[PDB]
Design an enzyme around this catalytic site. Structure first.
Site, PDB file in Angstrom:
ATOM      1  CG  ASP A 135     -54.755  46.804   2.221  1.00  0.00           C
ATOM      2  OD1 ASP A 135     -54.286  46.020   1.363  1.00  0.00           O
ATOM      3  OD2 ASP A 135     -54.220  46.769   3.287  1.00  0.00           O
TER       4      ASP A 135
ATOM      5  CD  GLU B 249     -55.580  55.472   4.227  1.00  0.00           C
ATOM      6  OE1 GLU B 249     -55.770  54.677   3.718  1.00  0.00           O
ATOM      7  OE2 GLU B 249     -54.536  55.588   4.776  1.00  0.00           O
TER       8      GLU B 249
ATOM      9  CE1 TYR C  89     -49.768  51.905   8.440  1.00  0.00           C
ATOM     10  CE2 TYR C  89     -50.835  53.480   7.298  1.00  0.00           C
ATOM     11  CZ  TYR C  89     -50.894  52.257   8.100  1.00  0.00           C
ATOM     12  OH  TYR C  89     -52.212  51.623   7.864  1.00  0.00           O
TER      13      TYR C  89
ATOM     14  CD  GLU D  80     -55.366  52.768   9.202  1.00  0.00           C
ATOM     15  OE1 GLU D  80     -54.436  52.739   8.427  1.00  0.00           O
ATOM     16  OE2 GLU D  80     -56.596  52.453   8.815  1.00  0.00           O
TER      17      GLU D  80
HETATM   18  O1  LIG Z   1     -51.669  49.186   4.339  1.00  0.00           O
HETATM   19  C1  LIG Z   1     -52.271  48.998   5.176  1.00  0.00           C
HETATM   20  O2  LIG Z   1     -51.863  47.886   5.707  1.00  0.00           O
HETATM   21  C2  LIG Z   1     -53.130  49.799   5.530  1.00  0.00           C
HETATM   22  O3  LIG Z   1     -53.007  51.247   5.370  1.00  0.00           O
HETATM   23  C3  LIG Z   1     -53.896  52.368   5.100  1.00  0.00           C
HETATM   24  N1  LIG Z   1     -53.762  52.826   3.982  1.00  0.00           N
HETATM   25  C4  LIG Z   1     -52.592  53.617   4.114  1.00  0.00           C
HETATM   26  C5  LIG Z   1     -52.325  54.061   2.778  1.00  0.00           C
HETATM   27  N2  LIG Z   1     -52.514  53.540   1.596  1.00  0.00           N
HETATM   28  C6  LIG Z   1     -51.379  52.925   0.962  1.00  0.00           C
HETATM   29  N3  LIG Z   1     -51.092  51.698   0.518  1.00  0.00           N
HETATM   30  N4  LIG Z   1     -50.167  50.872   0.191  1.00  0.00           N
HETATM   31  N5  LIG Z   1     -49.015  51.719  -0.008  1.00  0.00           N
HETATM   32  C7  LIG Z   1     -48.987  53.044   0.516  1.00  0.00           C
HETATM   33  C8  LIG Z   1     -50.060  53.703   0.933  1.00  0.00           C
HETATM   34  S1  LIG Z   1     -49.445  55.229   1.158  1.00  0.00           S
HETATM   35  C9  LIG Z   1     -47.842  55.190   0.591  1.00  0.00           C
HETATM   36  N6  LIG Z   1     -46.979  55.825   0.590  1.00  0.00           N
HETATM   37  C10 LIG Z   1     -45.862  55.814   0.154  1.00  0.00           C
HETATM   38  N7  LIG Z   1     -44.858  56.970   0.380  1.00  0.00           N
HETATM   39  C11 LIG Z   1     -45.403  58.322   0.654  1.00  0.00           C
HETATM   40  C12 LIG Z   1     -45.443  58.327   2.088  1.00  0.00           C
HETATM   41  O4  LIG Z   1     -44.418  58.171   2.624  1.00  0.00           O
HETATM   42  C13 LIG Z   1     -43.776  56.963   2.348  1.00  0.00           C
HETATM   43  C14 LIG Z   1     -43.480  56.884   0.842  1.00  0.00           C
HETATM   44  C15 LIG Z   1     -45.303  54.395  -0.268  1.00  0.00           C
HETATM   45  C16 LIG Z   1     -46.393  53.558  -0.239  1.00  0.00           C
HETATM   46  C17 LIG Z   1     -47.910  54.018   0.316  1.00  0.00           C
HETATM   47  C18 LIG Z   1     -46.287  52.037  -0.676  1.00  0.00           C
HETATM   48  C19 LIG Z   1     -44.857  51.554  -0.660  1.00  0.00           C
HETATM   49  C20 LIG Z   1     -43.874  52.766  -1.590  1.00  0.00           C
HETATM   50  C21 LIG Z   1     -44.105  53.964  -0.608  1.00  0.00           C
HETATM   51  C22 LIG Z   1     -53.841  52.728   1.654  1.00  0.00           C
HETATM   52  C23 LIG Z   1     -53.680  52.097   2.929  1.00  0.00           C
HETATM   53  C24 LIG Z   1     -55.595  51.903   5.156  1.00  0.00           C
HETATM   54  O5  LIG Z   1     -56.092  52.600   6.074  1.00  0.00           O
HETATM   55  C25 LIG Z   1     -55.556  50.322   5.593  1.00  0.00           C
HETATM   56  O6  LIG Z   1     -56.938  50.123   5.198  1.00  0.00           O
HETATM   57  C26 LIG Z   1     -54.730  49.678   5.108  1.00  0.00           C
HETATM   58  O7  LIG Z   1     -54.907  48.271   5.382  1.00  0.00           O
END
Ligand SMILES: O=C(O)[C@H]1O[C@@H](N2CCN(c3nnnc4c3sc3nc(N5CCOCC5)c5c(c34)CCCC5)CC2)[C@H](O)[C@@H](O)[C@@H]1O
Ligand SMILES: O=C(O)[C@H]1O[C@@H](N2CCN(c3nnnc4c3sc3nc(N5CCOCC5)c5c(c34)CCCC5)CC2)[C@H](O)[C@@H](O)[C@@H]1O
Lengths: 582, 582
Positions: free
Chosen positions: A159, A398, A454, A489
């Site tokens: 990302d 990650e 998060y 993070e």
């Molecule tokens: O994204 C950012 O800004 C930063 O975050 C970190 N990373 C986090 C993990 N990863 C993700 N990227 N985008 N979306 C999700 C993840 S994981 C996840 N899990 C989810 N569900 C399970 C966990 O509980 C809540 C529900 C959901 C989502 C995501 C997206 C919307 C739907 C629900 C890559 C980015 C990176 O270190 C950083 O480089 C990046 O910049």
């Protein structure tokens, strides 16, 4: 091997080749037409060093797929051929190919660590043509990892935007035919004595063939002298480099007709159950995960912003920061030594997770990075091992830590990690969301548990209450490991300027409530050893419905302007010591 | 004297001293305590080059009054003492004082043009201490001019913040004991021939004592050779450097053991009544007045943004730009040669107007700058005289052009100007608002009439109609002079993001209506020879009720983001040729 940061010493030399080079985008035929030989026709202008994507207009430049050709006129007076002459590339991102007068001399895979090559034997005199050719393609064989319509386009498994080009500086230096190639100073402090002091062990070796070193302090007063390839240097009542209070001794290793000096800090790092100890004191990480991201420099080095960020961090009452998702420039690494910023060094190992149906470590239809992954673990520790600022290493960001073949993939790198570290500093990996204590191969391979959770955005947002119990549940489970857990993070996208009395997602108010909640829980567990917010500042990503003109999770804007939460943290950390938080 | 842009040539050398130097603010006692001798205690970190004001937090740094001390470890191998060794300071703003090992060697007054000093005879071997000491005070003896509570604070007579420090790079180069000190190539084009061509005159001279030069083209093919101190170089069917279509020949003056090469463009500039002619063609200025302003670099050089601005200008369909209110960096001047940006060079002569009761040129209680003013007119033309991009000079910005002693002050500088220009390019001065044809000493001293009028903001705003007739009235009166008039400044502060269907001042909509109106009039007079908006981008000023976090009159933001008017202009200039607009 090993690589020193080139400086101006009586023995060597240094000339910054960086400027505005001749530039052309590859059309495909460019390589067989052998553009590296001749000059480049219909050329363009491009400053070096800086990633080129955001320095011209139109998608043609920004989203280009494939190769770019840098060309530069190199030229030297003959009296220098006297000496070793070297070409150190601090970082041309991804793959690099160097031609001089028309012949490929060097090549590198990896766009975040340096690499050099000597020119004396193929350096013609007169006008010489240097041609660095960069490629921006990412796949399953690169770190970082690129995944998989019409027309070609890189699809990153990470990302953040894919800025490439000559990201860090290009220069020439020179050494004597027999030269210093690598220092290595360690230390054992004898906190024995109420008033403490210790002694350091050096380890020079050269490349024909005397060898013995001098020691100094901040201002320049000498304190000792000795001889040998691997001797000692006792110091009595020494000043321990500490977080936000840096003391740096300096070393003048005079050997042969070669002299090079090295700044060094004395500090102790060792884990003890659920307590990260620097100088045998219980630390707490206060800072953020950041990026080498500015405008329009792209990922190109920006020394002014470097100092500006460090000032903002001191202004905010921070102490730590994880290196993005890749090694940072040497200038920044050293600057953290002078200012005393405890730093977590990370490899370019982001994208080792295909759960985003073949598995991540499927040995035929999957990741193919373990080899190259081992090289950077070598080339990085080979580069910053002498930095008191570096308290820890992280091998990947990650990764699919809880998938089959996870252990069998990482332990070889962990071993190589804690075996090449001349200080045996802790090693870790920041796990993605969805990992459990009983599930993450890092629960055994790592000394510190660092989470990327998060709860309040992706999870539970906007329901900050259910999100709270969620984090409390996962957090306590991590206590069962009896080792230090630190959040590297947590954050929430917010557009600076969007306000609301009853907050909603993307407002400044929500971002503060998010951090308020998570922090409230962090403070409930004496085994949580530091909070790092994501991110320090808004940075550029690639376009998609889920990114509002890049990433906006930063506490500051891309121009370094404080969102409201930047003040919340400055206040909270204001009331949190570097040591003794429990 | 004269100063060449140091480059890497077989003959000379070059090492960029810029990095993160040791830094301390003067407390007053600093000079008598002789901090220049020893190192600096309790020192701070500061990147060079960049103006230091915005790289630490708190008003202590930003608004500091007085002296700052830079300190840097300089060091060289003995085999270089072989050659001339030089220290070229491209620009430490305001006053500079250099100590080496503890002895003041050089000094300069003027923070926008280079100055050098050789080190061979006082350059000890080993560890050498360089200490540049900068001062930021402005008064009636400096250009720019500073005017006249508790505690000291500079009060600038100009509308932009007072960024000081080592604004441009610090480096070391070396030449042979007999070296080239100054080139000078002119040209007379014989547009005689339907297919034209011309010949150029060189003028080298050295400083012991052969001398004869080679000529090339873009790609590197040689086209001629000759001898002498002041000879010729005929070319047949030559490519004329033109606006937005730059062709640059190159020159290899090989003399003694010294070789230095020079890029050059062939172009003709001469006024003819009410028509500015480049290459004997009627031009029209399309661009803006800009600034060397970025964040947090201050006025420090930013090569990436330089190329980014030039791209934006090409993207916007522009061709010209006036140099702020001071000479710009050499790298930018050359970059305009490669990209073909017609440039107006301006001196640091802003603030020569005390009508903001002693008069401006009161010879005892008033301005005291004529002398130093003459030096920069010398040092600047001595620096950029070989730039095809430079079409004109401006000796001062908004001076009291219509006050007693105005003529008696400027004509001496005009004369010195058009006498040292080896190409006799036009000279001008941009007059403030309130000047009339029958009132401005520039009506006779200048070849081009360039106005800084603002009918719609300061005058008449928001009544764009009365403001219209106003500009129409003053504009036509300027026609009586029968010479070219071009607006080098019109604009209106607008906060990007503020919108309204019925516009009001500071909205994006108003800014567009303002430029719509003024442009409508500009297009009514065949003797108006170009429009330059103020400003290119929002820049930092000093605080006051009339500045909304700096200047916001730019078409773009400080981070280079387009306001709505940036698109209006891109469209309008889209429909306006560089030549033949009448
Ligand atoms: O994204 C950012 O800004 C930063 O975050 C970190 N990373 C986090 C993990 N990863 C993700 N990227 N985008 N979306 C999700 C993840 S994981 C996840 N899990 C989810 N569900 C399970 C966990 O509980 C809540 C529900 C959901 C989502 C995501 C997206 C919307 C739907 C629900 C890559 C980015 C990176 O270190 C950083 O480089 C990046 O910049
Ligand atoms: O200001 C800017 O942004 C840029 O403008 C240019 N300079 C314009 C002249 N000068 C002024 N600065 N500030 N205010 C006024 C002037 S003149 C003038 N005349 C005025 N009245 C007579 C003319 O008709 C209208 C009424 C009025 C005002 C001003 C201010 C409000 C009251 C009415 C210095 C700045 C500079 O080249 C540039 O460096 C600067 O950045």
């Amino acid at each position: 091997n090993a690589m020193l940061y080139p400086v101006l010493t009586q023995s060597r030399l240094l000339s910054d080749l960086s400027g505005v080079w001749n530039f052309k985008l590859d059309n495909g035929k460019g390589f067989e037409e052998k553009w590296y030989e001749k000059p480049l026709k219909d050329a363009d202008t491009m400053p070096v060093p800086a990633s080129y994507n955001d320095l011209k207009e139109g998608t043609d430049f920004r989203d280009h797929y494939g190769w770019v050709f840098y060309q530069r006129n190199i030229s030297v007076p003959e009296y220098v051929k006297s000496q070793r002459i070297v070409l150190r590339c601090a970082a041309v991102t991804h793959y690099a190919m160097i031609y001089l007068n028309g012949k490929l001399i060097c090549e590198h895979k990896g766009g975040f660590l340096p690499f050099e090559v000597e020119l004396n034997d193929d350096l013609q005199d007169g006008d010489n043509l240097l041609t660095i050719a960069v490629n921006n393609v990412i796949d399953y064989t690169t770190l970082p990892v690129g995944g998989k319509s019409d027309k070609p386009q890189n699809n990153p498994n990470f990302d953040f935007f894919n800025y490439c080009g000559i990201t860090r500086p290009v220069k020439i230096y020179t050494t004597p035919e027999t030269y210093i190639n690598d220092i290595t100073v360690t230390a054992d402090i004898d906190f024995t004595k109420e008033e403490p002091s210790a002694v350091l062990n050096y380890n020079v070796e050269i490349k024909n063939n005397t060898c013995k070193v001098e020691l100094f302090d901040e201002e320049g007063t000498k304190l000792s002298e000795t001889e040998g390839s691997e001797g000692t240097f006792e110091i009595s009542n020494v000043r321990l480099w500490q977080p936000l209070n840096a003391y740096l001794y300096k070393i003048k290793v005079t050997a042969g007709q070669d002299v090079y000096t090295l700044p060094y800090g004395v500090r102790s790092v060792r884990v003890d159950g659920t307590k990260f100890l620097i100088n045998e004191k219980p630390f707490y990480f206060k800072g953020y995960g950041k990026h080498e991201d500015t405008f329009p420099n792209g990922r190109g080095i920006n020394l002014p912003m470097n100092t500006k960020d460090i000032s903002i961090m001191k202004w905010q009452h921070a102490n730590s920061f994880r290196t993005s998702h890749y090694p940072y420039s040497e200038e920044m690494m050293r600057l953290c030594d002078e200012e005393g910023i405890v730093v977590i060094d990370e490899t370019t190992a982001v994208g080792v997770n295909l759960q985003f149906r073949i598995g991540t470590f499927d040995k035929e239809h999957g990741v193919q990075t373990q080899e190259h992954h081992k090289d950077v673990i070598r080339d990085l520790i080979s580069r910053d091992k002498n930095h008191a600022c570096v308290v820890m290493w992280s091998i990947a960001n990650e990764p699919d830590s809880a998938a089959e073949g996870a252990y069998d993939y990482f332990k070889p790198l962990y071993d190589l990690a804690r075996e090449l570290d001349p200080q045996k500093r802790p090693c870790t990996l920041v796990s993605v969301q969805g990992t459990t204590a009983d599930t993450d191969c890092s629960s055994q391979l790592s000394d510190v548990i660092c989470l990327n959770r998060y709860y309040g955005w992706y999870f539970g947002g906007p329901d900050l209450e259910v999100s709270e119990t969620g984090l409390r549940k996962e957090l306590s489970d991590w206590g069962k490991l009896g080792k230090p857990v630190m959040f590297t993070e947590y954050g929430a996208d917010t557009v600076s300027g969007l306000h609301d009395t009853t907050s909603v997602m993307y407002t400044e108010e929500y971002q503060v409530e998010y951090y308020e909640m998570n922090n409230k829980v962090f403070d409930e567990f004496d085994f949580v050893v530091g909070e790092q917010a994501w991110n320090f500042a808004d940075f550029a990503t690639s376009q998609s419905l889920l990114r509002v003109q890049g990433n906006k999770k930063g506490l500051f804007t891309r121009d370094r302007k404080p969102k409201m939460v930047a003040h919340y943290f400055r206040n909270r950390w204001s009331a949190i010591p570097e040591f003794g938080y429990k």
